[PDB]
Design a protein around this ligand. Sequence first.
Ligand SMILES: Nc1ncnc2c1ncn2[C@@H]1O[C@H](COP(=O)(O)OP(=O)(O)O)[C@@H](O)[C@H]1O
Ligand SMILES: Nc1ncnc2c1ncn2[C@@H]1O[C@H](COP(=O)(O)OP(=O)(O)O)[C@@H](O)[C@H]1O
Ligand SMILES: [Mg+2]
Ligand SMILES: [Mg+2]
Lengths: 233, 233
Amino acid sequence: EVYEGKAKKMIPIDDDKLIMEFKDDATAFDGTKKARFKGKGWLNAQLSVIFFKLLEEHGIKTHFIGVAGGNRLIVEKLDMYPLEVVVRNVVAGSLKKRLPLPEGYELPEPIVELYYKNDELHDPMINYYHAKVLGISLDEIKKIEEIALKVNEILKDYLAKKGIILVDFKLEFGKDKNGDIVLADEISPDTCRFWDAKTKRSLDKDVFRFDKGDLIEAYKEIYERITGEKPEF
Amino acid sequence: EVYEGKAKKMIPIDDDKLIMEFKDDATAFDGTKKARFKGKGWLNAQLSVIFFKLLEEHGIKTHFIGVAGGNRLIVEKLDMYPLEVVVRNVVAGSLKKRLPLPEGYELPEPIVELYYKNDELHDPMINYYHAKVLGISLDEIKKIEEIALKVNEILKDYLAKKGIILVDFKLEFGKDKNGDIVLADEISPDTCRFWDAKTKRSLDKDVFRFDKGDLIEAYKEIYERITGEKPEF
Ligand SMILES: Nc1ncnc2c1ncn2[C@@H]1O[C@H](COP(=O)(O)OP(=O)(O)O)[C@@H](O)[C@H]1O
Ligand SMILES: Nc1ncnc2c1ncn2[C@@H]1O[C@H](COP(=O)(O)OP(=O)(O)O)[C@@H](O)[C@H]1O
Ligand SMILES: [Mg+2]
Ligand SMILES: [Mg+2]
């Protein structure tokens, strides 16, 4: 059986591999807002590949194995932590409701937030003690955050050289058969906030969230600035 | 000028001392539910004194200096951290909305949660990174939690020998002139969950929160079980 999530489908290959297929569907505000954008899947697939390859070069262990053409990646099957790990460099989104700081406030150092993946409870934020009750040891949490913080440096530096501010982003992790902590899911304009360095405008899912313009146009601009090429689809 | 909070008034004495006066007012659900209970102030004052004295004996630094008769304590003036520090031994209250665990679930080890004191944002939970942005260093946070966890052991052990389960409780802290971290505010049936060991019933502000019975009767039962004496008022 294939798992069909809000944005991607996961097709089993064997015991240790999956196909991650990116859909054109977009959801927001915990699923209340919905639309489909032709080519969104392709862009998010291609961009994930570029980011995973960049991170692998820097010695980040990711689930990325290869491409299966189109909107499909081949990825290592992992035993997933029930976490969303959010790294924040610039104040935006939900952080404005947690710290009395304005949108665009540049953080002196990165913030890491842990969210417990649980639909029933609406993905509440947790700390290290909650994580322990969930079966995640302090060492594991520490290794996870150390990876997220390294990922942050690499992506923000890379993107800055392209005139893009990495505002924040969301990661997921799992364990491989050796018990190593492996970066999973996706890295795309769906799961990151990207702002133009010159204009400060959103080139990410916030365009869809708040009707700030044309989503495909914004995701394309990201692809074009990153690759140097115009997207083929 | 005197500071008048929801439950207590703080009267300045000199440069380094305050009077903490406990009122009969009770509030719940971030101030939406209100009532007054005659003698509540007295009970919460007396009980805070007993707890602060118990903790001082165990080498916990608290703001407790002495009594000024009635509902008034003399306390050291501190430069307060903008935090509420919650220690949890048994699942109850807001934790049920954060972990899919039932009320009464006994935790394998204590949970410490940090809340940023901010009316505008409704006291959101924060982690160590948020605390840093707020000007609280990691060392400070670590010392705070180490104290809270020690306080927990002492109170839970003490209360268990009296047939009372310490379910959770909320602490506040500030810095003294030497830059030491000093336990502040109050320790009472207002700020702790106390359950009868035999019956599991609430002997705390939850009685008022959820109309579980007579608040004064419940606070009295706590006083009587702790002191061995019937409250004089
Ligand atoms: N390497 C992996 N192994 C197993 N599961 C993964 C891996 N990477 C991502 N996942 C999970 O696969 C699903 C990806 O599809 P998605 O549309 O994002 O689903 P959802 O809407 O549940 O987040 C998610 O449940 C995600 O946690
Ligand atoms: N030692 C102390 N020094 C300075 N302020 C304190 C001390 N202990 C408690 N406080 C503060 O004094 C007030 C106590 O009264 P309270 O009725 O609880 O007010 P509030 O409704 O604002 O919590 C709180 O603002 C508390 O943080
Ligand atoms: Mg997802
Ligand atoms: Mg108070």
